[PDB]
């Protein structure tokens, strides 16, 4: 019966592929022919933020476009004023091997975790005026790889145990588990109309998950190696992904397929991080080659480059008003660009 | 602008306090030699020194040794956390799982992010290797056919009273990891082999001696003397 179920899975995958081919009118590159190119984007480092003793391994920006969080494998989690360069907090951690961090959309809380296979949440607005662990979300059976708040009560996590989970932070328990990935889940992105999220996972796949129903609407499989990075396009109808196969790729939700791939044979590096600019028109990506490429999302031209780091660009992010890019790296510095 | 000046003063005081803390923590971080500990389930890695953590000090030098215990068998993402450790300690049960140990060693050695990290190689359970070649059906010849053509190095040191067959088997298994490490070391990283068995206390000295050699060879490379 295992061969009959595997053969029916081949029949279903061939049927899904034919259903996608029925939808496949033209490559986005042809649709956008009349659109004017972006031309040479010039962005310059407007700040360097320094103070981490070891490789910065993660980021998130605040909804205020003003504070940001970064984590490093010395066991520090620093919160910065990006306008003034001042460190606002510098949280010590129980386990030094952090692999992600996040900042609640209110700015009231920060989350992080890594090889401890725990997500630890920190309150920034305590009555005692001090940062401390509000809760530890233990229960993942492999490293925490990404996490992201919906609000001050709800957090989505991603794990080396090949699952995502939704937690209620007061409860301290998994409100749902999302289980269908076959490799280590690497990264998350939440929808702007926050009812859906996407993940990519050390297999060629990205999945679109329904937050309320608890199981994936769609599986996207066009990549060629481990998806490290994922991000929604700003309307929530499409997403980018970057992987060890050195391509970024743009996927629709609504057409259930790739629209475009972003590459050069000049690039043989895994992609660590991806984000759009506010209009969606630029797709920014960080690479193992120590720099970032800025892509026209509608063309696949390299509209520019950000190149300020002595070691791997580990993380990247655009402010909620689009006013800057931040990038972190294994040399321990953040750069902010505009 | 006094409303701004009040907040600037508050951020300046916060920043300067945080920088005082980060300076003291920079001393604790730099004083401490982080190590990653690896091996199969049969490898006695839990008994080499006398995540899971193990802090020890030798001659006033702090070694902090990490074992990634409670995680999945596929490792290519979590292993990247250790690109900045001072050494990898790699532990092998001498016995057939030796080929699994060699393929694991090869993948640790050739990884893009581990290219700069020296390996301290503990070939453990040498008492079991000794008795299981003093008796038993020479099965090392069947697992590794090159053990017909191999013979001991003339720079090999026997321990007092070990039989030449034990020396032959010891130094053969040792030299396979030397074949793997020599093939691509590029002077950027080195392999430090030691023979050991579960009763040894001297392993704690051996890790300190090899961390001297790692940091010496790093300084000699930096000044173009290697």
């Amino acid at each position, epitope marked *: 019966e295992l061969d009959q179920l*595997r053969q029916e899975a081949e029949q279903l*995958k061939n049927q899904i592929r034919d259903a996608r081919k029925a939808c496949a009118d033209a490559t986005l590159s042809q649709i956008t022919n009349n659109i004017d190119p972006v031309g040479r984007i010039q962005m310059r480092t407007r700040r360097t933020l320094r103070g981490h003793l070891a490789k910065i391994y993660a980021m998130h920006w605040g909804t205020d476009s003003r504070l940001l969080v970064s984590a490093s494998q010395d066991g520090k989690l620093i919160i910065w004023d990006s306008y003034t360069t001042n460190k606002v907090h510098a949280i010590p951690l129980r386990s030094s091997w952090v692999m992600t961090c996040a900042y609640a959309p209110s700015g009231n809380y920060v989350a992080c975790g890594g090889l401890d296979n725990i997500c630890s949440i920190y309150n920034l607005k305590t009555r005692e005026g001090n940062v401390r662990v509000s809760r530890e979300l233990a229960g993942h059976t492999g490293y925490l790889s990404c996490c992201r708040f919906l609000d001050d009560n709800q957090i989505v996590t991603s794990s080396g145990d*090949t699952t995502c989970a939704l937690w209620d932070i007061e409860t301290g328990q998994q409100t749902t588990t999302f289980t269908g990935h*076959t*490799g280590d889940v690497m990264s998350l992105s939440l929808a702007p109309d926050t009812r859906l999220f996407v993940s990519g996972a*050390c*297999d*060629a796949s990205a999945k679109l998950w329904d937050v309320r129903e608890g199981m994936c609407r769609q599986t996207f*499989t*066009g*990549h*060629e*190696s*481990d998806i490290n990075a994922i991000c929604f396009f700003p309307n929530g109808n499409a997403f980018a992904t970057g992987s*060890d*196969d*050195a391509t970024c790729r743009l996927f629709d939700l609504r057409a259930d397929q790739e629209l475009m791939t972003y590459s050069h044979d000049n690039i*043989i590096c*895994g992609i660590t991080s991806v984000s759009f600019s506010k209009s969606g028109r630029l797709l920014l990506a960080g690479y193992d080659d120590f720099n970032c490429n800025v892509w026209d999302a509608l063309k696949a031209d390299r509209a520019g480059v950000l190149a300020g780091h002595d070691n791997r660009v580990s993380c990247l992010g655009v402010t909620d008003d689009g006013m800057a890019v931040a990038t972190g790296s294994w040399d321990s510095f953040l750069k902010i660009w505009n | 602008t006094e409303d701004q000046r009040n907040e600037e003063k508050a951020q300046r005081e916060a920043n300067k306090m945080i920088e005082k803390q980060l300076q003291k923590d920079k001393q604790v971080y730099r004083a401490t030699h982080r190590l990653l500990l690896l091996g199969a389930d049969n490898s006695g890695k839990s008994t080499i020194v006398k995540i899971f953590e193990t802090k020890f000090q030798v001659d006033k030098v702090n070694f902090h040794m990490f074992d990634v215990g409670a995680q*999945r*068998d*596929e*490792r*290519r993402k979590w*292993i990247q956390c250790f690109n900045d450790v001072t050494a990898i300690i790699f532990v092998v049960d001498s016995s057939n799982r030796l*080929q*699994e140990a060699l*393929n*694991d060693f*090869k*993948s640790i050695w*050739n*990884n*893009r992010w581990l290219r700069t990290i020296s390996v301290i190689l503990f070939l453990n359970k040498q008492d079991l290797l000794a008795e299981k070649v003093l008796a038993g059906k020479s099965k090392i010849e069947d*697992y*590794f*056919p*090159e053990f017909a053509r191999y013979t001991t190095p003339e720079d090999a040191t026997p321990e007092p009273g070990e039989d030449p067959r034990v020396t032959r088997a010891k130094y053969f298994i040792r030299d396979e990891f030397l074949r793997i490490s020599t093939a*691509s070391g590029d002077g950027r990283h080195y392999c430090y082999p030691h023979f050991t068995c579960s009763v040894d206390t001297e392993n704690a000295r051996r890790i300190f001696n090899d961390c001297r050699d790692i940091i010496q060879r790093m300084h000699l490379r930096q000044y173009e003397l290697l």
Partner: nanobody
Amino acid sequence: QVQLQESGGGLVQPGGSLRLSCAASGFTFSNYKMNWVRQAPGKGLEWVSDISQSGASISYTGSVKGRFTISRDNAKNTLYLQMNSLKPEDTAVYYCARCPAPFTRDCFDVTSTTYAYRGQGTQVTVSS
């Protein structure tokens, strides 16, 4: 979609010979070092052999040196294992596995119990 299908297998006599085949799709096969791994009944996965991107560098387990030969076709997107002088001890499912990232010599997870970049495998049974 990254996939590998193995072909060749079934029962064969001890002392015999058999060529395994693997066909790839969803990747530019030339960029990947590629592998055979095997699982004997009731026992763990073990590594059998490697071939590099160019086919110039190759390797085998000590049980297998001379007895099996690995080869590849970067224009057909296929990997092969020609097997000679089979022992009863070679009785296993054989899997075509790929190194995870393109352009490198490390291949950590090709022997891992679950792994994304191997085929379904084919049975090879060595008996009368």
